[PDB]
Design a protein around this ligand. Structure first.
Ligand SMILES: O=C(O)CNC(=O)C(=O)O
Ligand SMILES: [Mg+2]
Ligand code: NI
Ligand SMILES: [Zn+2]
Length: 331
């Protein structure tokens, strides 16, 4: 068995190897990469996502989210308070302000220490989940707006034609902005490209050990657990690496820098934070190996997690028994 300790693997494809996306994913899995839940892909040195970022300031963040924390430093929830619209130029200036900017630090480890010590005492503003793309249309390799669609994968593997579309999302971050512990909708893959700015630190639990994280989360967030049988789908809960180590949960960490891709694999729980002003683009995707994870994915039926038009069809075809109750949650 390849990668039996479930370590995060890092790949350096040549420009020749960067032509066929599907084939490269299948290669990485042949080497055991999926066992970690997360992989890093460093693009060939010849590749570029676009020529410059010089003209992005006029993108609108229609609903910036203020991430307000509750709890203790290593075990907290966050709620998202909606703020007034602002441009990316306005948001970058805010991220660089004395109130919001990255503190002085020695290296990524000292910054990680400061994040876990102090996150709860601040409410950074996250421009998350913005439909759009920063890839130039002329970028032909690993262009997250040109991937094969999940609906087309389901049709190729299973023969069934379904409605829905699959488009990317932009994330504009600042110091302390946080992504809570989650897997993807329908336990899909994700791919995330850091277009510019400061780094993003990731934490991940190997898919084979995902239920260990769930059992810990039910113990740490006991009222949320009684409210919903899949409450990590609400994407609100944080648990620090120190608390994970104290409870014996297997995990890994890695820091992604500008110009790098990350792939998350089916049922790979992940969480993390931004080091400063940055912009990432991400999209979900599928392979043949995903289908079985999709059939088994948990679902939020309490009604909090409230998810896309395209997820309807996935539930309806892969989980027809749940269909019914899940759509009661989504209406
Ligand atoms: O970048 C972020 O805030 C969150 N991204 C993801 O969870 C992902 O790409 O799967
Ligand atoms: Mg612009
Ligand atoms: Ni994710
Ligand atoms: Zn729920």
């Amino acid at each position: 068995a390849q990668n039996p300790n479930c370590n995060i693997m890092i790949f350096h494809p040549t420009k020749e190897e960067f032509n066929d996306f599907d084939k490269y994913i299948a290669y990485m899995e042949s080497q055991g990469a999926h066992r970690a839940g997360l992989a890093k892909i460093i693009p060939p040195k010849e590749w570029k996502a676009r020529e410059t970022y010089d003209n992005i300031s006029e993108i609108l963040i229609a609903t910036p989210l203020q991430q307000v924390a509750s709890g203790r430093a290593g075990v907290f929830t966050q709620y998202h308070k909606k703020k007034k619209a602002m441009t990316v130029g306005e948001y970058r200036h805010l991220a660089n302000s004395k109130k919001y900017q990255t503190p002085p630090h020695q290296n990524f480890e000292d910054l990680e220490r400061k994040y876990w010590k102090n996150r709860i005492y601040n409410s950074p503003i996250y421009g998350a989940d913005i439909s759009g793309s920063l890839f130039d249309e002329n970028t032909k390799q690993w262009n997250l707006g040109h991937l094969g669609t999940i609906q087309d994968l389901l049709e190729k593997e299973c023969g069934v034609v379904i409605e829905g579309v699959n488009t990317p999302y932009l994330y504009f971050g600042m110091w302390k902005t946080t992504f809570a512990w989650h897997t993807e909708d329908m336990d899909l893959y994700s791919i995330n490209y850091l277009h510019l700015g400061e780094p993003k630190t990731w934490y991940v639990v190997p898919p084979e050990h995902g239920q260990r994280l769930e059992r810990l989360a039910r113990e740490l967030f006991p009222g949320s657990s009684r409210g919903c049988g899949a409450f990590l789908r609400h994407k609100v809960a944080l648990i620090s690496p120190t608390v994970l180590k104290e409870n014996g949960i297997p995990f890994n960490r890695i820091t992604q820098e500008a110009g790098e891709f990350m792939v998350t694999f089916p049922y790979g729980y992940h969480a993390g934070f931004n080091h400063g002003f940055n912009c990432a683009e991400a999209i979900n995707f599928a392979t043949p190996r995903w289908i079985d994870y999709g059939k088994m994915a948990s679902q939020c039926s309490c009604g909090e997690a409230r998810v896309t038009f395209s997820m309807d069809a996935f539930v309806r075809i892969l989980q027809p028994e749940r269909y019914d109750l899940w759509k009661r949650g989504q209406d």
